[PDB]
Symmetry: D2
Amino acid sequence: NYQPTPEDRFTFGLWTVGWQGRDPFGDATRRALDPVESVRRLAELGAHGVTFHDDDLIPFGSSDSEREEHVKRFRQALDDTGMKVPMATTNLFTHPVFKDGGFTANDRDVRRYALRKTIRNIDLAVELGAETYVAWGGREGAESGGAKDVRDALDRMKEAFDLLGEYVTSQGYDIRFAIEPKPNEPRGDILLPTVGHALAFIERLERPELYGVNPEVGHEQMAGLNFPHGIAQALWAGKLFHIDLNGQNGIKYDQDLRFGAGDLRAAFWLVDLLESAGYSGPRHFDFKPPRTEDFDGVWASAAGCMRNYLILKERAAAFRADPEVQEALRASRLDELARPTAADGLQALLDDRSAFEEFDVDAAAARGMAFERLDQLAMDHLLGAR
Amino acid sequence: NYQPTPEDRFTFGLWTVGWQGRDPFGDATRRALDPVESVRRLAELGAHGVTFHDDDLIPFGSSDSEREEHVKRFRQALDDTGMKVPMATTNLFTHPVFKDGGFTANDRDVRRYALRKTIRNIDLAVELGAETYVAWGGREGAESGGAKDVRDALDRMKEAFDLLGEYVTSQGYDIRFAIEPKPNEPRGDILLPTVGHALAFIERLERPELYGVNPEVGHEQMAGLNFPHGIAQALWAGKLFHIDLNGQNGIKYDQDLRFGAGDLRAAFWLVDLLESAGYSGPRHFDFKPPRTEDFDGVWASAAGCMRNYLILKERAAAFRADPEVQEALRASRLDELARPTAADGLQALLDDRSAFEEFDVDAAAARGMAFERLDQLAMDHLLGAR
Amino acid sequence: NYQPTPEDRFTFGLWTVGWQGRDPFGDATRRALDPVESVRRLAELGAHGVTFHDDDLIPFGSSDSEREEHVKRFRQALDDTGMKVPMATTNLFTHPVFKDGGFTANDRDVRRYALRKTIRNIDLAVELGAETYVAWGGREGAESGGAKDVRDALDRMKEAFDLLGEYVTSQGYDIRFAIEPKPNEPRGDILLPTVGHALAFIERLERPELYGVNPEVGHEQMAGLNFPHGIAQALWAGKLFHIDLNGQNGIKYDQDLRFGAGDLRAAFWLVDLLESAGYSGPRHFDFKPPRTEDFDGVWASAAGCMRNYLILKERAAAFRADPEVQEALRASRLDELARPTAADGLQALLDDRSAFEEFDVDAAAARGMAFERLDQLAMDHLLGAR
Amino acid sequence: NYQPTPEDRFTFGLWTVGWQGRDPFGDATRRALDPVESVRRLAELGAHGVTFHDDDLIPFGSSDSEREEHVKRFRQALDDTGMKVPMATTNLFTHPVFKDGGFTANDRDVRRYALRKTIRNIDLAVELGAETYVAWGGREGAESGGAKDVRDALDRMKEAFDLLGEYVTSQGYDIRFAIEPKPNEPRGDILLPTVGHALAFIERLERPELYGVNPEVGHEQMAGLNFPHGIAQALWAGKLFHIDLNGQNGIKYDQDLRFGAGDLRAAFWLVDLLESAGYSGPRHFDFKPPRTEDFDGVWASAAGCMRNYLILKERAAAFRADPEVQEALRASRLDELARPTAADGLQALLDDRSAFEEFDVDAAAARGMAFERLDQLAMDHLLGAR
Ligand SMILES: [Mg+2]
Ligand SMILES: [Mg+2]
Ligand SMILES: [Mg+2]
Ligand SMILES: [Mg+2]
Ligand SMILES: [Mg+2]
Ligand SMILES: [Mg+2]
Ligand SMILES: [Mg+2]
Ligand SMILES: [Mg+2]
């Protein structure tokens, strides 16, 4: 029943199944996992590959000797299992030096350090074959209004990303960047808080074609926003380079539940969109197995991520293939939404008396949209009840 | 005490002080106001000008004769008082024909009608001297996932705004457009839900220089977002063409309280930013006097809008002029935030061993940011308690 | 497929399918429905009965003659269809006189009027056979802090409900009261904002056994609360006299979507609880068919309310009957949660060295709770994918 | 300027100024503080006393020898400074054994352990002179619906608190309990999520007079609720035994900002209420100095807590003493809210034709409430601008 293959392109971060369960009010409930064991266990479950922060793979403060040993053992597990590494990223948030940010820290020497730590890990990412480099600026922000002049901060943020674009262009690397937005936590407010703010920032970079977004289900839902809508806007702009899948129950702390938990109907509309638009990138899970769980529960939670995606894929495909649904879509005029408003042009529209002077407003107004029957067909399909 | 003059450029919509108090659960508690009387009373209070939707000024379905009579009486009140009309907009949300939207309605004939109704009011706006034309797409959106393909909807939205840009370019009008975002209400989710999503959409229009944003305090706060931060991003992009001021107590229905109500410290940081950046446009209030109030209370609420802005302006100016505050800003390194990270360039940064190999991370980490003393000086100034 | 019968005890308010679609930003999109036609159409769909506010049935300001005529025609439709009237309530929110409340209005003459309007409709409710009388104090509250001394307001609220209890005791009526909480809208904050605040208030009334709660799915979700949890607390206290079913997508304006829309997994856990606890009252829908819809869509939306309840009932019953689920419940120690902590008593617990001095904390800590496998079995059952 | 004395009864938890800055995404930024030094530094700032969790004072797993040494050194610092210990509480949330709760853990042996750990610390609290014992059940709850049967959990919660009441009655201790509600974090949903749910639960305990609430500003605001309103309901019920003061910016993770930060007008209305009702208990701060700060900033943040309370006390007292404000309160009929609705009794009200048959609804409806002028006087007073 609903078994994943490496062809489904499911990926997990080392830090996901590796989360030891330390939260703001409690100590860890699980021992540390060796990244080599996580690679093996994930390959057994049907995953396609893994992702990493620099500091997940190479402990902070490691000598070039220990660094080389850690990478070599990782490489061997990849060769042994067939697992890929499609994305990597930088930890610019755990160590105390980043307490006021990395790229937008008020201290200039910290910003320079942040850039050098990033560039070193871009080299490693290319070596391991990654196509996408993600940046989540979790410490870029403020708890108080006077601590951060946001215009100056956006200048420094642009400067950082422009320098990174110069670096990969100089080296001839085939890698693209993806900015991951989040509205708050751990800072009181985070810069570039939603998909839209990130898309707008990208258009001010020197080489905008090198940058896209890495949206996360739970993050947009922490602002009360419709995640499938934001993903549609990112696809419309040609900027969905990567995506993070998980679950969230509303406006509260970042829960990082397994995918399919949280807002189930939103998860259905998301899969419908991703499959219908032909998104071809990794289906990456950024989730945390609850700290109530032991290691058997960690792997059950990971498996459930993939299972829920495949069940929703099946139901969304049945929905769109149903002749009764295609009829209802025409009844609600989704076909007319796809047709241009005025391909005749501005002058024709102005001269068209049926568009205003002779337009029957009351006849158009009384036409029902038939959206509630359409949505109940969608419910019936989701629940396997047609 | 804190008396406004027309030099402060305070403006109000006719629909604000004119709101009769009808809400989803109750009938109106006040009689209709003649726009001529609203103009006189606002001029007496020290306002600079007024704004309007087409349907606030000319009742829907009016003959060209009645239209001319309504405009002439309005013009006369403006000439009598010295009041200006800096902005106008279109009602694409009240009449039943717009129940699924105007520019993104699924029905093509409704979209054409929406465009013609808008163009007619652009002509009137130019005649009355408006510099800015606002578009709030309050019905553009959905309550259910299958009712609206958002990529097709964004195509239709771009098509509409592009045609409007062709129209004003054709006519030689000196007017710019400002898109007003809102996350929800009256639709379950509204397209372009925040300042960031609107800024990103503008960069895909054919003539992006003609378009900017008209953010509203309460709207960004309905998504839990930091309004001064979003305004800083809009200023950084050169896109703050207009602004709507009001108050909101958190994530809930759109309250439209008078300015200064709701989140008072956010209102302080907003005024600080607007004055420090030299924003030169109208300070426009989109608010609703609570339906508990009679007409004496309507004018008290309007007066309070302007009063609160002027008190906050005074306190923000005292904050920034205080030598002890300028010292604390240097203590928190706001001066270093304004200096480039790497004006030496990429190669210099890579060769700079003090940026990584010889960087003392523990010494930098132990440096306090001193942000809590800075924020208490800001509190003391806001409260008049230094 | 999943057809309701009057035995399922589904009920609808006249004001639900009767909503004409007027919202704060738009005029009505549907004509008024005659309550006689709503009764017939609902009986055809399989409903059990209907509910009403006084002003839904008898237009405000009606003579005793017109009142009698309106009731007689309603009675006849009930006799013709077999439909029952299990609950009634009072409109203390639409007319302008209630703009600062009914029972807690600052004006004493309005409070007296509110009580007399209520008592007149209690008599009618008894005549029509209602068992439950609901009070939703939608105008009891404030937009500003100084307008309402909440201690005095709670005194007036208690006084009102105590007088109502004296009235029904005097008359010998077999009717109970149910208070309906809501956190906000249309007032900025509403008194008794959640199920918990209402339960606590009831314990200070003179005759607490006459009063219970009428919680609404969407209302508790406007505070971000877990609705099944609140319903469990109300059942634990013996106070769930009635319930309002609908859907809501998070913290925002009151959406009143059809039941099953909004938070689908919460709807599943709610049905599981109601059926497992043997709740025997009406399954009442307080919803609004979206104003995008014509009358065919109104009835499709009503039908979908009942359909979704019956599908979820079936899946929750399959979940609890599954031997693999009963095994997993024992694996997560739900059986031990049901056993007393210390039926041996306080002295035995203090003398029990295995409870502290010889308790192995690290062995207990390492035991996994197995909650993620249990929740995936619940997901599989909900989606019909075992 | 605004200097606190021990007469102001300001108290702080050891865990507040002692927070090392570890958050879910970052390591600690400050070294551990010796509780002896925290006592001295707080006494220097003008605090009245301190509070503690068992595990803040005596490291978990300490021998009776080390326990005695830790208490003796604490006692000496108290004797040296004059500081009091008015409240204590139990850590039932940090150690992994409490990962599914303490009093409502599914495992029975963990629940017994939780009760024994609590009882041992009640004895210590009495020895140190505490009058109030707080219980915050931060782990009592769930992330998934099937993990916790809430009726059984409330049975176990009642059983635990009843046993604790039997214990203190047996020992003859003069101490009362205060339950602290929180809606979520660190569990996905927490049992007894608001002040109202806690007040309702207390009325089902065997000896309800021994129990009250300990509400926290930020916690009620994480549900979007009006904190002064909830505090008024707790005062009305006679159950405000203790209070936790801090700041929060809306619906998001628990920020624990210093008091006066976050919602400033809510802080003003809270102080107005506490002073006007004659609340006589400790003004306790449960806050976290941001991890951006060094130790100088920790003490600046603590000082600011007390400063902001004293400034707001002064402004609220000026507001209520202002003759123009007392006039406006009569204009909005706050005097009539305080007078009984029907001291004449039920029969008199029914016979009073001026209450219904001859009541002029339109005359009452047109009366303005004058609430916007009242609220602007409150704003003017808060800002020191009359
Ligand atoms: Mg996350
Ligand atoms: Mg992520
Ligand atoms: Mg608004
Ligand atoms: Mg606006
Ligand atoms: Mg509702
Ligand atoms: Mg209801
Ligand atoms: Mg807290
Ligand atoms: Mg606390």
